[PDB]
Structure formats: C-alpha cells, structure tokens
Amino acid sequence: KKTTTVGVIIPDISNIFYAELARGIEDIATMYKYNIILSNSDQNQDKELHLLNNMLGKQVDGIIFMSGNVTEEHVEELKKSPVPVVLAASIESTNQIPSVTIDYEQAAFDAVQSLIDSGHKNIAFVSGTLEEPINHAKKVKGYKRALTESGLPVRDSYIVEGDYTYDSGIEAVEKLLEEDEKPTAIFVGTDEMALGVIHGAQDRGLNVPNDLEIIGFDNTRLSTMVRPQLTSVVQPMYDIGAVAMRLLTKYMNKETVDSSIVQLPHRIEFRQSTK
Amino acid sequence: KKTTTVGVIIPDISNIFYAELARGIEDIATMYKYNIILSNSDQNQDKELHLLNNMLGKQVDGIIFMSGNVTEEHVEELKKSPVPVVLAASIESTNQIPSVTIDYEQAAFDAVQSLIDSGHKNIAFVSGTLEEPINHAKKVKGYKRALTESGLPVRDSYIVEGDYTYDSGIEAVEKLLEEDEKPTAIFVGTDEMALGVIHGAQDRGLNVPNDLEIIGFDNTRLSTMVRPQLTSVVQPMYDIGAVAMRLLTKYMNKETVDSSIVQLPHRIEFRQSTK
Amino acid sequence: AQKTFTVTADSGIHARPATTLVQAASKFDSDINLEFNGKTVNLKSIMGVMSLGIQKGATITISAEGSDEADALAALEDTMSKEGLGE
Amino acid sequence: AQKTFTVTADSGIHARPATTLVQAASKFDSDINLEFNGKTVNLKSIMGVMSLGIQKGATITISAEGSDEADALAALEDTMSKEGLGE
Ligand SMILES: O=P(O)(O)OC[C@H]1O[C@@H](O)[C@H](O)[C@@H](O)[C@@H]1O
Ligand SMILES: O=P(O)(O)OC[C@H]1O[C@@H](O)[C@H](O)[C@@H](O)[C@@H]1O
C-alpha cells in the first residue's frame, strides 16, 4: 500500500532555480527515509497532468508539485489525489492545495519601495512570462502598489516581459532604454535576467548603479557572480523545497499541521547594483 | 523482478554541472519508459557506497553513478552489482565499469595548445580538487603535456587548486598574480572558477584578454553570462547524461553494445576571454 | 529521398534539441540517417547522433528510405526549423 | 543550560547548514530550542527553524533541557563553528 517514496514533478531540473529546490526536497526526504521520483514537465500542462497519474499509478506516499501555472484544471486533479500533495514555489488563488512559497507580492513591493526611498521616480520592471500568476498576480502587483502608494505613475511601457533567459534580460534593457523618459532603476523578476539587464546596459556604456540601479529576485549564486554584485530579493530556494517536503511528511505521517499555506520569510540582500 | 526504474547517485543536484547531466538522463529515461530515483551523495565515499545498496535493495533495472572519485573500493562493489551500472562524467583507470565522458586529457591539452599557438609561454592552470583523478590524472597531465611538447617549463607554482567555487577562482588568480613571472594566460578547469578568475583579475585592474587570456571548461551557461564572454572547452553535460542513460538501456534490454567506454567529441568555443 | 541543411543552432545538434530531432525521426517507418563530415548514422539513435558532435555551421544531409520517405523528410525539415537547428 | 551566539554565516541559518544544525540537535534527548528576536522554536524542527529566517549578524540563543543538556549544548556549539554558522 505504501512505498515510502514521494514523486516530484518539476518544469526543468537543469534550471538552477529548480535544481536548488530539488536539493532541499531530496535532503529532507532522505532525513525522513523517503525516496524521490523526479520528473521534468517543461511547463507543459498536458505533460504535467499526465505525470500526475504516473506517480499515483506507481503508488507514492506523496507528491510535491512545482509549476509556473497551476490552473483550475490542475487543482481539480490535485484535490482528487489519494495522497498528500504540496505545492512548492507555485501558487493557486483558492489556497485549497497545500503550498510553501514566500510572499511574492510583498517582496516585489519591498524591492521597489527601497528604490523609491532612494529617490527614484522612474522605475521599470523586467518580468518573466506575464501569463504565470506569480508574475501578473503578485510580482507585478507588488511593483504597481509600491508605485501608486507613493503617488507615482504606473506606466505599462515600463513593464517589459522576458522569458527568464539571460538574453531576454539584455533585450529588455535595450527596449526600456528606447523609452523617452529613461528609467533610473529597474526591478528584475529573476537573477539570470537581471544579469542580462546589467550586461545589456554596460554594453550600452551606462554604469550600474550610477546611471541605473538594479534589483533581482531569488538571490541565487549568480547574484555574487556578477560585477557589480547584484542586490537581490531573497527567496530561500532550498528551504522552500526542504520545508515543502517536511510539510508533506507531516501530512503523510499524520502529524500536527499548523497551516497548509506557508510563506517563508523574505528579505533583500543589498550589494553593489544599488547605491 | 524488474521495476523499469533506474537509480542515479549524484554528488549534488543543485550544482548546475550535475543538474545538467541529470536532465539528459531523465529525458532519455522518459523516452525509454524508465523512472529515476535520484540521490545526493555530496562526494562522501561512505554515503556513496551506502546509497549503492539502497538502490539495489529496492531492485532497480539499472544504476548511473557519478562521482569525483571512483576508488578501487567503489569499483569492487560496482562489479558485484546484479544490474548494469554506467558511470557518467566520472572515471576509473581499469575501464572495467562502463562509462560515458569526454577525453579530458586531450581536451586540456587542446586548450593549452591554443594558448601556446597564440604566443603564450607563461601559462597557468587553476584546477579543482587535485585529489580527483579527472584533475590530477587527466586535466593536469593534458596541461603539462602541452607545455613539454612545446618545450616550455612545467612549474608547479603555476598550478593552484581551487574547490570549484567562484570564490576559489578569485583566490587563485590573486595567488597566481603574486608570482614573480606573471602568467599571461590561465586555463581554468571549470567555468564557475573561471568567472572568479576573470573577476578577481578585473578587480585587480587587469584587463581580460589584453593583460591575461583565460579559458574555462564545460561550456556551461555561465560562459555567456560573463563579460568578456568566456572561451571554454566544451563538455556536453546533457549528452553525457543522455548517452550514459541510452548505453544503460542497451545493457538493460540486452541490445548490441559497440563499446562500454565512450568519449563524446569535445571542442572549444572561442569567445572573448581569448584573443 | 533526402534534404541538406546548414546548422544554425549555436549549440549545434546537441542536448534537448538533439533529443527532439531523434524523437521526431523515430516516429516514422522509413530508414532515416544523418550524413556529416563523411559519416552516416541512424537519426533514430541517441548515441549515434550524439557521437558525431555536430557543431554550428556544419553541413548535414538527412536521408530517408521507406514507405513514408517524403513524410519523414518533410516532417524533419519542419522539425529542423521548428527547433532552430538549421535549413 | 544554554549558549548565545552571533551568526557569521553570510547566508545566515538556512539551506544545508540549517539542515545540519537541525540534524545535530535531533541526535539528543534533551529539549533543544532556538531563541531569536523574542521567538523560541524547537531546534529539532525543519519548519520551525526555517520559519524564523535567521539572517547574518543576528543574535540567537540555543537552549537545552534534558538528561544530556551539556552534551547537546556542547555538541551544537561545535556544530555552530564546524558549520561556520557563528560563535
Ligand atoms: O535562478 P534565476 O536565474 O533567478 O531564475 C529563477 C526563475 O527561473 C524561471 O525558469 C522560473 O520560471 C521562475 O519562476 C524562476 O523565478
Ligand atoms: O559548471 P561549472 O561551474 O563549470 O562547474 C563544473 C564542475 O563542478 C564541480 O562541482 C565538479 O566537482 C567538477 O567535476 C565539475 O567539472
């Protein structure tokens, strides 16, 4: 009936972002004597839904699911699952499915607010795929809210979407630099794109942070592998995977659960891309 | 008797290097309807040997093993395994255990040779943990052989070991720059360290590649996320994992195997860290 | 019964885009091969295709021999550009 | 029955070094807790310890109450520096 092995569905294990979450999950599974069956979905809803059956059809004591877009259809099938399912670094509005993340909306806001407190009025936002709820529902809103609350304009041409790749980061700054009212600060929704934003601007000759201040998100290892060193919002990738696994072992072993909706603390690591 | 799930032992899934190999393995396993049970060992021989039993004790149709140091004791237990075992990006002198890699020694040599062909006489080598055979048995030897064959001195103070971290890359250049006869070119055994070598030198004010040319190894995504863009020896991480898995499915399904010792082609991607 | 291309992918024919080109040829009946630098391999084989190490700028010729030649060759030409490999 | 430290780890008490500090306290019988910013949690709990988000430079106080207090507290002080967390 029970195998002591949990299945984990992930968009792409080769991405440092997901690879970090996987290490946390794996470590805790090990700690609590569980085995993991990892499977890449590549953000393909069809693949994702299919992989769900597979894991269940191989009877696993649990499921940790990660995805950039947990749709109503996903939620429906996840509620049907015979075993405990915990979402990691992913969100669905109803909160019916257990999940571990950070307060994205609040973190985006704090990020932009620090740029405003620094005297910035023209602040842009280079975002990842706008379709994904963490982006349009949270990060974007946190960015906009910081603007409005300080009584600043909320221009849509100041928001350009990338695709998480370092190159899109480059293409984003150039597009933003084509604007008449040049931004003086840029909040990027991901470290890899922020590196592209930093480089794309240094290739255009501007200096970071003198001509343009920048802030990234996740605080991956890339943040320290840039010059200047990237100021970045901290999302504890490992902790998220670790805690999401622990939460899962609580459901699996029927322990006392305080809340199935967990938001780990976030902060900002100020480095050199900001003044 | 058979589960159609192979076990993979890996030092650390969060490292981009191993995460890349894992994606290739996973993709091919999927293609051939297999499941994977990933487990981190952290280069701990005790952990590694233990994890071997675990996988076998859970009856898996195969095992893909990765490690920086496959010792005689490891080989002994691997030969004892009831199921096909293929080594990925790892080596053991006897060639008794199937493996997929590249010709490390030849690749290090080609790397240094191009620096010599470019007019360099004082060439250093920033290496990873010297204890690991790929380093002292291959990369180092390829580096030395390129030197001797061109009738150049083989100074040991020109070889400093890092620990694969970006910081060790920084510490390595500074140590190398303390040398009386400053190197004009540096071959780094890993992309992450090469970034640290590039930055550590730009922080010391020198210019790459004018004052110092640099070449890395692996050609990860970091190579293009630096300025200048890193010239790097190409090791197809994904292909290595993919092919190592395919080779494994050949043994598992008893297909025709041409050779259990595979060395995929390597080349050098010349970018900006070289002239 | 065949088409020739110039690989545009900066990564050449490797990694996932190579697993994709293999997957595609495998969905046919004909006998699809890859001709490169005077070496021909089975385009339905991961090891074979990845053992060639086809870099960017190289010239390759995919061949098809079977009851669905044109279909394979045409679908692959579509995969070639769909995957940004070449044309 | 307790010791106080200043976290030196630039990453603070997180990730593996946090899983290690948890693992360590868990190897005892006493009741080990972590005191931070006026909040105490069970040092043997992953969620508890990671829900505090202890950054670098913070001051924490690990406490022990059991038949092996000094042993736990001493072993943890050793883990504290062995892991570069603080002292
Ligand atoms: O690790 P980095 O480069 O900051 O990238 C993280 C991002 O990587 C993307 O692939 C994910 O879709 C995002 O959700 C994630 O935040
Ligand atoms: O991906 P990068 O930064 O080039 O690092 C690769 C290296 O990472 C190290 O951790 C491994 O021990 C090496 O064997 C590997 O070559």
DSSP A17-80: HHHHHHHHHHHHHHHTT-EEEEEE-TT-HHHHHHHHHHHHTT--SEEEE--S---HHHHHHHHH
The CA distance from A128 to B10, in Å, is: 31
Fold classified for C1-87:
Histidine-containing Protein; Chain: A; (3.30.1340)
Nearest to D47 among A27, A247, A266 (CB): A247
In three-state secondary structure terms, B123 is strand
The CA distance from B17 to B197, in Å, is: 18
Whether residues B130 and B57 share a domain: the answer is no
For ligand 2, mutation pick of B12, B13, B15 (most atoms within 8 Å of CB):
B15
Q: ∠ CA(C3), CA(C4), CA(C8), 5° rounding?
A: 130
Whether residues B166 and B64 share a domain: the answer is no
Across the strands, what pairs with B262? B100
B267–C contact, CB cutoff 8 A: yes
Note the resolution in Å, 1 decimal: 2.5
Whether residues B114 and B200 share a domain: the answer is yes
Whether residues B154 and B81 share a domain: the answer is no
Whether residues A139 and A272 share a domain: the answer is yes
The amino acid occupying position D77 is: E
The CA distance from A89 to A111, in Å, is: 19
Whether residues A34 and A136 share a domain: the answer is no
The CA distance from A271 to C58, in Å, is: 44
Between strands A159-161 and A123-127, the pairing is: parallel
H/E run at residue A16: helix A16-31
Whether residues B173 and B230 share a domain: the answer is yes
Whether residues B208 and B146 share a domain: the answer is yes
Ligand of minimum distance to the alpha carbon of A69: 1
Nearest to A26 among B5, B35, B40 (CB): B40
The CA distance from B238 to B17, in Å, is: 9
Whether residues A246 and A122 share a domain: the answer is no
Helix/strand/coil percent split, chain D, to 5: 35, 30, 35
In three-state secondary structure terms, D60 is strand
Contact residues for A103 (Cβ-Cβ < 8 A; gap 6+): A263, A266
H/E run at residue D32: strand D31-36
H/E run at residue D78: helix D69-82
User: How many other CB atoms are found less than 10 A from the CB of residue A255?
Assistant: 10
Considering only alpha carbons, which residue of chain C is nearest residue B239? C15
Cis peptide before B228 (omega within 30 of 0): yes
Q: What are phi and psi of B161, to 5 degrees?
A: -95, 135
Domain ranges in chain C are 1-87
Chain A residues in contact with D14 by the CB 8 A cut-off are: 236, 238-239
10 Å CB burial of residue B35 (0-12, 13-18, 19+) is buried
Nearest to B38 among A38, A166, A224 (CB): A38
Domain housing B58: 1-103+235-266
> Catalytic residue at D47?
no
Contact residues for B145 (Cβ-Cβ < 8 A; gap 6+): B105, B109
Count the residues in chain C: 87
With tokens 């569980």, the residue in question is A34
Q: State CA A110 to chain mean position distance.
A: 15
A262–D contact, CB cutoff 8 A: yes
Considering only alpha carbons, which residue of chain A is nearest residue B47? A30
The amino acid occupying position A3 is: T
The amino acid occupying position B171 is: E
Counting the structural domains of chain A, the total is 2
User: How many other CB atoms are found less than 10 A from the CB of residue B245?
Assistant: 31
| CATH number, residue B134 | 3.40.50.2300
H/E run at residue A216: strand A213-218
Q: Are C62 and C2 in contact (CB under 8 A)?
A: yes
Q: Are B168 and B162 in contact (CB under 8 A)?
A: yes
Q: How far is CA B4 from CA B37, B63, B108, B249, in A?
A: 11, 11, 38, 10
Tokens found for residue A165: 């790749």
Q: What's the B166 CA to ligand 2 centre distance in angstroms?
A: 10
**Where are the alpha helices (H) located in A83-149, listed in sequence order?**
104-117, 133, 140-149
Among B71, B61, B83, residue whose Cα is nearest residue B5: B61
The CA distance from A211 to B198, in Å, is: 24
Q: Are C42 and B24 in contact (CB under 8 A)?
A: no
The CA distance from B36 to D41, in Å, is: 36
Whether residues A5 and A58 share a domain: the answer is yes
Q: How far is CA B171 from CA A265, B157, B160, in A?
A: 33, 14, 9
Ligand of minimum distance to the alpha carbon of A166: 1
Among D50, D4, D43, residue whose Cα is nearest residue D21: D43
User: How many other CB atoms are found less than 10 A from the CB of residue D2?
Assistant: 13
Torsion of CA D35, A114, A111, D58, to 10 degrees: -20
Torsion of CA A243, A245, A249, A254, to 10 degrees: 70
Among B105, B99, B181, B109, residue whose Cα is nearest residue B137: B105
Whether residues B54 and B66 share a domain: the answer is yes
Whether residues A199 and A227 share a domain: the answer is yes
Put simply, the answer to whether C52 touches B265 (Cβ < 8 Å) is: yes
